[PDB]
């Protein structure tokens, strides 16, 4: 329900807030907002209330969709009514009120979004993990990577503090939903070159400090998806 | 609307801006099976009612999780008592759960009142990690979800020239299917089913020799992570 500030300086904040639950994020920069994967038509008023402790919903200029899934995108009609924001999503999904002038299509290799503070955000290619058109968002100023489904925990604190206790919450999901070790290890190599201090997924607790390294090391060697093709037929 | 198969007890029916979507209905001894009804809800209801009372839809099949498949889920659960079959990967992600039947990864059979079966066909990573087609054994029609989809609005109901249909499907399959490894396994699996039609969720239907043409083309297609330098 309530909002938790993960990073703060004078001009810029990164804020957290039968089904798997979902994590929603807000970036505030010189008083303007960027909303990350707000999906979930249910208590739309919970997210609005939480946002309103930091910024007028008026002032959300950008809404970022990591990919096309309903847990990401379901509430899109409600946000379009109270904001004038553009919606950033992979060009794979744009061609599917919802008026086309609200869409910013992200090309396959990503793009940057400039912020009033002088900092940038970078859309991080994350394709086929699982969706063929998926991006993360790297907030350069905080060094927080919003990673979409990557790092997600699906089975029921803010930060991970024991990777071994966390592993059972993420192992089945990554083994089955990430497409292959080939895609997963290239992503790790790409993300390592960013030097994120946190990895904040769309489900479950956030990786910070040594747990970023722990997660990245585990993922880069994971066999997943079509690596077990005999399980898929 | 176009009747694709019909005998005394069993029919398979195509119910007739954004890329547009194909909705299908199976009628069997007077009961209904709706395929991917997602995507003017008042059009689909009326169209269904030309063949069957919406009362009598017992089953709704979702090939995967995307909004063009699932967006109308609340309305279909509200106006029917049908169960919804979907990959177990997605049951816990469609924001009452006892109405969802999770399909296990290797598929399952769904029995029809006439005695015929429908088979859920594993179609994972093409594109969604949890995707199934529905093979209606009596008609030998495979409803294929996104596989075979055309996204460019050219012209016709059945594919009649594979080479002319190709520009409408090539880019979609090259970019959205995960790898040649997965698609050629799928082709080999579908070859052992001997479908007389492949009916996709977008674009024209492949029948007879065009089933052959599509499968031969897809089985050699380099796609998805095969072009990984384009993805970073
Ligand atoms: O897919 O979460
Ligand atoms: O249609 O993806
Ligand atoms: Cl997907
Ligand atoms: Fe997802
Ligand atoms: Fe998700
Ligand atoms: Fe799809
Ligand atoms: Fe589709
Ligand atoms: O998702
Ligand atoms: O889809």
Q: How far is CA A102 from CA A69, A87, A88, in A?
A: 18, 6, 9
C-alpha B124 – ligand 8 centre gap (Å): 16
Name every residue whose Cβ is closer than 8 Å to that of residue B113 and which is 6 or more positions away in sequence. Answer: B28, B29, B30, B31
Tell me the CB-side half-sphere exposure of residue A58, using CA atoms within 13 A: 3
Query: What backbone torsions phi and psi does residue B150 show, to the nearest 5 degrees?
Result: -110, 135
DSSP A207: E
Angle, nearest 10°, between helix axes A210-220 and A163-177? 40
Query: What backbone torsions phi and psi does residue B75 show, to the nearest 5 degrees?
Result: -70, -40
Torsion of CA B190, B194, B195, B198, to 10 degrees: 30
- Residue B99: closest CA among B55, B60, B149: B60
Tell me the CB-side half-sphere exposure of residue B184, using CA atoms within 13 A: 9
Contacts of A71 in chain B (CB under 8 A): 93, 95
How far apart are alpha carbons A38 and B198 in whole angstroms?
37
- Residue B53: closest CA among B61, B45, B42, B64: B45
Query: What backbone torsions phi and psi does residue B137 show, to the nearest 5 degrees?
Result: -60, -35
Name every residue whose Cβ is closer than 8 Å to that of residue B34 and which is 6 or more positions away in sequence. Answer: B23, B24, B25, B48, B57, B59, B60, B61, B76, B82
How far apart are alpha carbons A15 and A3 in whole angstroms?
7
Classify A26 as helix, strand or coil.
Answer: strand
Identify which of B177, B185, B230 has the shortest CB distance to residue A229.
Answer: B185
How far off is chain B from A11, nearest CA to CA, in Å?
Answer: 31
Dihedral of alpha carbons B63, B98, B93, A200, sign:
negative
In sequence order, the β-bridge partners of residue A28 are: A13, A33
Q: Is the CB of A149 under 6 A from ligand 1?
A: yes
Q: Which two tokens stand for residue A32?
A: 């303007």
**Which residue of A lies nearest to B68 if distances are taken between CA atoms?**
A96
Contacts of B122 in chain A (CB under 8 A): 232-233
In sequence order, the β-bridge partners of residue A26 are: A15, A35
Q: Which two tokens stand for residue A40?
A: 């979930």
> Hey, how many other C-beta atoms are within 10 angstroms of the C-beta on B38?
18
How far apart are alpha carbons A218 and B174 in whole angstroms?
30
Torsion of CA B223, B87, A71, A160, to 10 degrees: -90
How far apart are alpha carbons A9 and A72 in whole angstroms?
28
> Hey, how many other C-beta atoms are within 10 angstroms of the C-beta on B73?
21
Structure-determination approach: X-ray
How far apart are alpha carbons A232 and B12 in whole angstroms?
27
How far apart are alpha carbons B225 and B175 in whole angstroms?
9
C-alpha B64 – ligand 6 centre gap (Å): 7
Residues, beta carbon < 5 Å, ion ligand 7: B 68, 146, 201
* Cβ contact A132–B129 (<8 Å): no
* Cβ contact A176–B89 (<8 Å): yes
* Cβ contact B228–A186 (<8 Å): yes
Q: Is the CB of B36 under 6 A from ligand 9?
A: no
Tell me the CB-side half-sphere exposure of residue B13, using CA atoms within 13 A: 21
Classify A69 as helix, strand or coil.
Answer: coil
* Cβ contact B230–A132 (<8 Å): no
Query: Pairing state of beta strands A32-36 and A60-64?
Result: parallel
How far apart are alpha carbons A63 and A43 in whole angstroms?
18
Q: How many residues does chain A have?
A: 233
Name every residue whose Cβ is closer than 8 Å to that of residue A70 and which is 6 or more positions away in sequence. Answer: A39, B65, B67, B70, B93, B94, B95
Please check whether residue B133 is in contact with residue B63, taking contact to mean a CB–CB distance below 8 angstroms: yes
Chain A residues with at least one Cβ partner in B under 8 Å = 18-20, 39-42, 68-71, 73-74, 92, 95-96, 100, 108-109, 125, 127-128, 130-132, 154, 176-180, 182-183, 186, 190, 225-226, 229, 231-233
Resolution in A: 2.1
How far apart are alpha carbons A54 and B54 in whole angstroms?
48
> Hey, how many other C-beta atoms are within 10 angstroms of the C-beta on A219?
22
Among protein residues, the one with the nearest Cα to ligand 2's atom 1 is: B146
Please check whether residue A211 is in contact with residue A218, taking contact to mean a CB–CB distance below 8 angstroms: no
Please check whether residue A144 is in contact with residue A197, taking contact to mean a CB–CB distance below 8 angstroms: yes
Please check whether residue B203 is in contact with residue B188, taking contact to mean a CB–CB distance below 8 angstroms: no
Domain ranges of chain A: 1-233
With tokens 């927080």, the residue in question is A144
> Hey, how many other C-beta atoms are within 10 angstroms of the C-beta on B59?
21
CA A20 to chain centre: 15
Nearest-atom index, ligand 2, CA of B128? 2
How far apart are alpha carbons B53 and B43 in whole angstroms?
14
* Cβ contact A70–B95 (<8 Å): yes
3-state SS of chain B is CEEEEECCCEEEEECCCCCCCCCEEEEECCEEEEECCCCCHHHHHHHHHCCCCHHHEEEEECCCCCHHHHCCHHHHHHHCCCEEEEECCCHHHCCCHHHEEEECCCCCEEECCCCCEEEEEECCCCCCCCCEEEEECCCCEEECCCCCCCCCCCCCCECCCHHHHHHHHHHHHHHHCCCHHHHHHHHHHHHHCCCCEEECCCCCEEECHHHHHHHHHHHCCCCHHHHHHHHC
Among protein residues, the one with the nearest Cα to ligand 1's atom 1 is: A149
Q: Is B209 exposed, middle or buried (0-12, 13-18, 19+ CB in 10 A)?
A: exposed
In sequence order, the β-bridge partners of residue B86 are: B102
> Hey, how many other C-beta atoms are within 10 angstroms of the C-beta on A154?
18
Q: How far is CA B16 from CA A36, A191, B150, B169, in A?
A: 37, 46, 16, 20
With tokens 């997965």, the residue in question is B182
| Residue ranges in chain A assigned as alpha helix (H) | 44-52, 70-73, 76-82, 91-94, 163-177, 181-193, 210-220
Identify which of B65, B176, B232 has the shortest CB distance to residue A109.
Answer: B232
């Amino acid at each position: 329900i309530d909002g938790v500030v993960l990073y703060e300086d004078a001009d810029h904040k990164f804020i957290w807030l039968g089904a798997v639950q979902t994590m929603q994020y807000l970036i505030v920069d010189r008083g303007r907002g960027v909303l990350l994967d707000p999906g979930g038509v249910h208590l739309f008023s919970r997210v609005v209330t939480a946002i309103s402790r930091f910024i007028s919903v008026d002032k959300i200029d950008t809404i970022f969709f990591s990919h096309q899934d309903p847990d990401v995108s379901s509430g899109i009609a409600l946000w379009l009514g109270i904001t004038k924001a553009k919606i950033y999503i992979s060009s794979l999904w744009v061609r599917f009120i919802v008026d086309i002038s609200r869409m910013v299509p992200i090309p396959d290799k990503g793009m940057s979004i400039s912020l009033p503070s002088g900092s940038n955000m970078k859309c991080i290619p994350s394709h086929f993990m699982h969706s063929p058109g998926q991006f993360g968002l790297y907030d350069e100023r905080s060094r927080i990577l919003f990673s979409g489904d990557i790092g997600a925990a699906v089975f029921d604190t803010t930060f991970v503090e024991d990777f071994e206790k966390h592993l059972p919450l993420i192992e089945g999901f990554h083994v089955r939903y990430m497409a292959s070790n080939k895609i997963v290890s290239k992503w790790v190599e790409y993300v390592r070159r960013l030097n994120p201090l946190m990895i904040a997924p769309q489900h479950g607790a956030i990786y910070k400090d040594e747990q970023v390294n722990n997660f990245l090391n585990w993922l880069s060697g994971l066999k997943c998806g079509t690596d077990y093709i005999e399980n898929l037929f």
